[PDB]
Amino acid sequence: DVVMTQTPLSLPVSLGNQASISCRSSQSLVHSNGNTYLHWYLQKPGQSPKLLIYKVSNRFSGVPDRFSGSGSGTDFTLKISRVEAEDLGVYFCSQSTHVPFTFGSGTKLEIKR
Amino acid sequence: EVKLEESGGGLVQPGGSMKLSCATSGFTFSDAWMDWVRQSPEKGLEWVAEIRNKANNHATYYAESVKGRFTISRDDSKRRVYLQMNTLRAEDTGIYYCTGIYYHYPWFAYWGQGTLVTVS
């Protein structure tokens, strides 16, 4: 299966800071249709993962422009500008180019003072 | 609105059995490929099972770790999908989500709330 890894596991920042998450795949995520099916989810405590960014860079319904996704091939990045309390949670990247679909281990975005 | 809701989770004894259900609405269920994904405390988020639509023989697919113990099934008239778990192991502890392939996104874009399965 395609292995997805995220750096870091825990990402302490200050409110108002930029945070950036790295997501790497063990295999190219470029599908035969030429598109790249790398997605990001955000999960809050006790809730389900919610789709945040899809196909590298597309914002899902209601997702602010402070979130930007980039990257290609096997190497991807989620950038969260001007971190707010509503952004805190665990971010997962995930690939659906290859079957079975697989998930990164997650990155906890948290505030440290 | 796409809606999914899991039920049936709970505390169960190793070797025991448990059936999860998923009630859905808001998309064309007849076309949908439906799935169970779990968030296990050992592996994290991992796909468990898939069942294809009627036009693909309702064919079933499983993760190697549950193959032979779990059965995924669907009721198209009810628009529900199920996961019968047998011979449950400590490994199987986790939050179980139903999701699948429907609406405008051919991946797991919409999940239920999840149901907690605890193997004691």
Distances (CA, A) of A3 to B6, B34, B53, B54, B84: 27, 23, 28, 31, 27
- Nearest chain B residue to A60 by CA: give it: B109
User: Where is chain A discontinuous (C–N over 2.5 Å), named by the preceding residue?
Assistant: none
Interface touch A51/B106, C-beta < 8 Å: no
> Which residue in chain A has the smallest CA separation from B112?
A48
Half-sphere exposure of A73 (CA within 13 A, CB side): 2
Record the resolution, in angstroms. Answer: 1.5
A·B CB contacts under 8 A: 38
Question: What is the CATH topology of the domain spanning B1-120?
Answer: Immunoglobulin-like (2.60.40)
Q: Which residue is listed with tokens 């389900």? A: A48
Judged by CB atoms closer than 8 Å, whether chains meet at A48 and B112 is answered as yes
The answer to whether A105 touches A56, Cβ cutoff 8 Å, is no
Return the structure tokens found at A48.
């389900």
Q: Could you give all domains of chain A from N- to C-terminal order, each with its CATH number?
A: 1-113 (2.60.40.10)
- CA closest to A2 among chain B residues: B46
Alpha carbon of A77: minimum distance to chain B alpha carbons (Å) = 19
What phi-psi label fits residue A104: left (phi over 0), alpha (psi between -120 and 50 degrees) or beta?
Answer: beta
Helix or strand (DSSP H, E) at B92: none
* Amino acid code (one letter) for A105: S
Question: ω before A100 within 30° of 0 (cis)?
Answer: yes
Long-range pairs, B6-9, Cβ under 8 A, ≥24: B6/B96, B6/B97, B6/B98, B6/B112, B6/B113, B6/B114, B6/B115, B7/B115, B8/B115, B9/B96, B9/B115, B9/B116, B9/B117
CA distances from A65 to A62, A90, A110, B61 (A): 9, 19, 20, 38
- Contact: B63, A100; criterion CB under 8 Å: yes
Q: Which of B79, B116, B111 is nearest to B98 (CA)?
A: B111
- Helices assigned H by DSSP within chain B: none
